[PDB]
Design a protein around this ligand. Structure first.
Ligand SMILES: [Mg+2]
Lengths: 1022, 205
């Protein structure tokens, strides 16, 4: 029956139109849970009144909205499969997921959308208890939907919802009937609203959030607000809550607010309805304000939740209580004073990681467990602050932060990366109503939570008039939280605190109308007072976080800089199944959705599954609150913490020489926040033997926090002890190497061992043991490494970029350069045989590098290699200078003395510390969704694999896969280990970088521009 | 002086319609639409978001929007007591120069006093003064004497230029002016509506 029929309802279409976000949708409110019992709200026990529509759901899929049958609303289609909800249909595989970093997947013609939009209709049949129908109002609630949906109840049209991220509530009281009621929901992948969010993440359209049914008494409080006021001392805090009651108003009915901390209440508030005689016509009929005074109230902080429990109860005069609402309360005051963001009277240093809520197995929907698992890692890793970019997180997620610890920054769900100019959608006056809903709706729902310290209007939306208007609205409705907006260059008027993204501390790059300066410079700008927090920094994609130390070093240095959120916490990948059915991670449009940005999407600090990227350890070390300075014997520890004494911190120091520790020292730690504690070691043992003493101090927690198990380590520091130089002499060995010469090859024999050098080749092809062959492939100099994600950048074969490191190397002929023997010679020392080889690498009649190597053979038969490398000034600097060989022998474990055990690079070697290290050979290789050179280790005095011993100072990566193989492969899963183990030894390695993926982020110092390089190492049997 | 077409005298509290987050889209159209159409004209020197709508969050948001879209013209809003953050220049209405009467949450002070208030720098222009209804404008000299006296006071618009009346026809068919709900529409505020400096026809009072 019209207008319930689909044809009438569909057109005029709402989704195409910019203006109407929703039809017949109740105003957003913080969740109450609608439980009648007073105890339950204080208890927080799951409410009886609340109902979950979550469960198996009937599903139908159609290419277009027009396509879906009219008949369905009356009845569920016979064909349609049953799919679990909340779910993303694309995850189900009905429709391939489409990912685009900047471009909207749909063609950009706002507000119009592609004529065929994948549409999924969900029909749910449920039975409503008779008791519910008779009294009160029942409204269906959706935690999340995408992009937009049309709601039909009992074959009757109910509502239209325009925002996926926000919860939408429709009232089903009229629609519901005794016995089972059919529910029909229609979801469209592409909406007029879709234009508003261009944020880059895998795009899945469906119901990714829980659907529940809520029952409210006819007289109930639609919304309530909690506010905190504190003395400068902070000893006494005044908390006032305002409650608004829906529908009928009774003089007799009263609202009581009780504040409960732990199991014991601190304060109680009771008021008659209405308050304050607001100007000028009348005092509010339905609004009551209750003020509760708390003295010495515990204050919520990232280190400590310090939560209070507040229950809002509306009850009769006698009186029975119609309804009960409970809201978690944390007492914190967040304000920007003197251009310095301040929390609870203390300047805040924020270490944060941008969080995208994604699951590879379940896609967009997030398991409750995942948040807890994610939350523990960030808290464990020294991360106190989490930012979600760029949409409101699951309703549950805010609650977890408040209990658990870390600060949360809410973000309005507006992005407009695609539009050119980007500001156009935000800027236009017409679009404001659509824009308003995301900012306005978000504030009401998330305002209550103690954890959130900030409001962010938009991400990458550019600067528009609406943002300025929107920013004003948030302040006026809520004065509690500072508002920051990235867009417009981050220098925009709307943002209280500057949030430059991907800003470089050392140097600044400016794009006309969007200048970017080093953070130190940016604060310094004329007429600028705002505290600056980076939206993103230290991009984690592939190898990442290089020069990470530099950013953090700056943050400590400057009072104004509050630090910035790292991007990004979880790499985004979707599981794919082989014919075998093995699961391989997919990057970019593996599914063939196009155009696919491919690899860049993952952007991940930690593996999805999830596992920690080698980079993550680096973040933990830099992040750690404690600061250690060492003079002589004495060790001084400075506490990062603003509010917390180190009640349960244990400090352990071990001193070892050459990977051996002479002594271990442990001291209890008792430092007040900002406190400095001085610890003096028992005098260190002195070793006559040559080597370098190492002092390592790490802080561990004797008792596990809820996040961390006991014996977990918050922080560690390593300092070299005074160096020892050994004048002891290797010589002399009775055996003398005998060399036999052929035109074809140079052969050296000592004892059992045989060494072969090829004159034509100019490199030594074979090393002989037994009765055995040591290496499959002749040792050669290697000036190249598989390109890192940063080096490749945005460059592609279709659209090559000159700037990218890979392009410079490729243009160079660096990869394809072929060695030639400039000269070669064989000579015999009385005690040893010395071989000198000179090689010139020439591309296109231009020589990129000249390498001279001399091999000297000891009486002992230990072999010493000295290499001299000359690099032309003109040529782009070689990524690495090293010699790589392939060894037939395969070993279970790799033992080396050097920085360990996590892979480390010169740009980011801070995390690593120097000690003897033992690892399974598989460990050395680091799994990546996209394969680039990985697993490098730095500052290693000695490397041991199997029989071979390597002595010298070098960076070594040992893996089955060839460097050539690594560069070739599209995906990590594809690679098959080559027989034997590839070994790479590098005298010097270029810095990984990078602050920005798009442009080379490598630091000037890190690059090997010297143009002259020397390194020597020793090849020793056993 | 252009005025956005928003008034909410009726609502109690009056600010409720403006104040509510939901109502903002409806509110926005009148302020946003008005600026684009009337922005071009040389004559307009001011933008006024609302009249007697009270003070709402939307007004603060709306006020910010007008400044950002257009920086050319000062924005003044009467509501909230006229001391509201949104209005660039204070516009107390029916304020008395000699003496001040205060209604809780909406204090009104003599204009000389009002500029003098602690932490106040804004130039003050009255939305209305010297009500012209019936016999009116008494003590009119006093207001003007004050305006000349004080540099900060910019003077205020008189209310109102034309008395509002509707022609009615007798059985004879002679036309007699009608005040209030002569037609019987109810309840009728009756006489107060005309509020006129000059006769409708028009003749000068
Ligand atoms: Mg974007």
């Amino acid at each position: 029956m019209i207008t319930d029929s689909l044809a009438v309802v569909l057109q005029r279409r709402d989704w195409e139109n910019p203006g109407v976000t929703q039809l017949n949708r109740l105003a957003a409110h913080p969740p109450f849970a609608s439980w009648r019992n007073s105890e339950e709200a204080r208890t927080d026990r799951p409410s009886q009144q609340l109902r979950s529509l979550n469960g198996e759901w009937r599903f139908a899929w159609f290419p277009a909205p027009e396509a879906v049958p009219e008949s369905w609303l009356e009845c569920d289609l016979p064909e349609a499969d049953t799919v679990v909800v909340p779910s993303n249909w694309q995850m189900h595989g009905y429709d391939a997921p489409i990912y685009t970093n900047v471009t909207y997947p749909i063609t950009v013609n706002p507000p119009f959308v592609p004529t065929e939009n994948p549409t999924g209709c969900y029909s749910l049949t449920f039975n409503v208890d008779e008791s519910w129908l008779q009294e009160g109002q029942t409204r269906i609630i959706f935690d999340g939907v995408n992009s937009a949906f049309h709601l039909w109840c009992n074959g009757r049209w109910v509502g239209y919802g325009q925002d996926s991220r926000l919860p939408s509530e429709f009232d089903l009281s009229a629609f519901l009937r005794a016995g089972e009621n059919r529910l029909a929901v229609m979801v469209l992948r592409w909406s007029d609203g879709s234009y508003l969010e261009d944020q880059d993440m895998w795009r899945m359209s469906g119901i990714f959030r829980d659907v529940s049914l809520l029952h409210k008494p006819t007289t109930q409080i639609s919304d309530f607000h909690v506010a905190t006021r504190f003395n400068d001392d902070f000893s006494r805090a005044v908390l006032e809550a305002e409650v608004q009651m829906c529908g009928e108003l009774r003089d007799y009915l009263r609202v009581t607010v009780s504040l409960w901390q732990g199991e014991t209440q601190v304060a109680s508030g009771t008021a008659p309805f209405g308050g304050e005689i607001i100007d000028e016509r009348g005092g509010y009929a339905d609004r009551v304000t209750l003020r509760l005074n708390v003295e010495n109230p515990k204050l919520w902080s990232a280190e400590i939740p310090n939560l209070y429990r507040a229950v809002v109860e509306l009850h009769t005069a006698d009186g029975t209580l119609i309804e009960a609402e409970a809201c978690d309360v944390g007492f914190r005051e967040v304000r920007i004073e003197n251009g310095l963001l301040l929390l609870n009277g203390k300047p805040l240093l924020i270490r944060g990681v941008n969080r995208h809520e994604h699951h590879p197995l379940h896609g967009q929907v997030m398991d409750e467990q995942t948040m807890v698992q994610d939350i523990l890692l960030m808290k464990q890793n020294n991360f106190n602050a989490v930012r979600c970019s760029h949409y409101p997180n699951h309703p549950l997620w805010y609650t977890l932060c408040d209990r658990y610890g870390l600060y949360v920054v809410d973000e309005a769900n507006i992005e407009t990366h695609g539009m050119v100019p980007m500001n156009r959608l935000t800027d236009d006056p017409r679009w404001l109503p659509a824009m308003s809903e995301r900012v306005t709706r978000m504030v009401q729902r998330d305002r209550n939570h103690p954890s959130v310290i900030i409001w962010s209007l938009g991400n990458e939306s550019g600067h528009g008039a609406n943002h300025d208007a929107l920013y004003r609205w948030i302040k006026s409705v809520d004065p509690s939280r500072p508002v920051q907006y990235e867009g417009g260059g981050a220098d925009t008027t709307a943002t209280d605190i500057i949030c430059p993204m991907y800003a470089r501390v050392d140097e600044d790059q400016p794009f006309p109308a969007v200048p970017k300066w080093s953070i130190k410079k940016w604060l310094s700008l004329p007429g600028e007072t705002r505290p600056l927090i980076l939206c993103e920094y230290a991009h984690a994609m592939g190898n990442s976080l290089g020069g990470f130390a530099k950013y953090w070093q700056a943050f400590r240095q400057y009072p104004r800089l509050q630090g910035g959120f790292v991007w990004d916490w979880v790499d985004q990948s979707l599981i794919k199944y082989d014919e075998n059915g093995n699961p391989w991670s997919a990057y970019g449009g593996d599914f063939g959705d196009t155009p696919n940005d491919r690899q860049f999407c993952m952007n991940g600090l930690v593996f999805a599954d999830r596992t920690p990227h080698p980079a993550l350890t680096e973040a933990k070390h830099q992040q750690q609150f404690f600061q250690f300075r060492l003079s002589g014997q004495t060790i001084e520890v400075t506490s990062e913490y603003l509010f917390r004494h180190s009640d349960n911190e244990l400090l352990h120091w071990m001193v070892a020489l050459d990977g051996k520790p002479l002594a271990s020292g442990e001291v209890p730690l008792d430092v007040a926040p900002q406190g400095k504690q001085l610890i003096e070691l028992p005098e260190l043992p002195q070793p006559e033997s040559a080597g370098q003493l190492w002092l390592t101090v790490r802080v561990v927690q004797p008792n596990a926090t809820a996040w961390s198990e006991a014996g977990h380590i918050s922080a560690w520091q390593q300092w070299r002890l005074a160096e020892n130089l050994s004048v002891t002499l290797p010589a002399a060995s009775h055996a003398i190497p005998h060399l036999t010469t052929s035109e074809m090859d140079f052969c050296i024999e000592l004892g059992n061992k045989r060494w072969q050098f090829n004159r034509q080749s100019g490199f030594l092809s074979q090393m002989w043991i037994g009765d055995k062959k040591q290496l499959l492939t002749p040792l050669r100099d290697q000036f190249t490494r598989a390109p890192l994600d940063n080096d490749i950048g945005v460059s592609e074969a279709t659209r090559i970029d000159p700037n990218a490191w890979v392009e410079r190397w490729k243009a160079a002929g660096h990869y394809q350069a072929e060695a030639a023997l400039l000269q070669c010679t064989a000579d015999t020392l009385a005690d040893a045989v010395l071989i000198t080889t000179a090689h010139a690498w020439q591309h296109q009649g231009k020589t990129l590098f000249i390498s001279r190597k001399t091999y000297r053979i000891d009486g002992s038969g230990q072999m010493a290699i000295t290499v001299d490398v000359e690099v032309a000034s003109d040529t782009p600097h070689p990524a690495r200078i090293g010699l790589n060989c392939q060894l037939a022998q395969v070993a279970e474990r790799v033992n080396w003395l050097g920085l360990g055990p996590q892979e480390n690079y010169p740009d980011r070697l801070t995390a690593a510390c120097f000690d003897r290290w033992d690892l399974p050979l598989s460990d050395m290789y680091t799994p990546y969704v996209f394969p680039s050179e990985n697993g490098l280790r730095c500052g290693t005095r000695e490397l041991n694999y199997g029989p071979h011993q390597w002595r010298g100072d070098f960076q070594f990566n040992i893996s089955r896969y060839s460097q050539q193989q690594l560069m070739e492969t599209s995906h990590r899963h594809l690679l098959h280990a080559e027989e034997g183990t590839w070994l790479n030894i590098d005298g010097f390695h270029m810095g990984i970088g990078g602050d920005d993926s798009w442009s080379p982020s490598v630091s000037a110092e890190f690059q090997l521009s010297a143009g002259r390089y020397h390194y020597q190492l020793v090849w020793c049997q056993k």
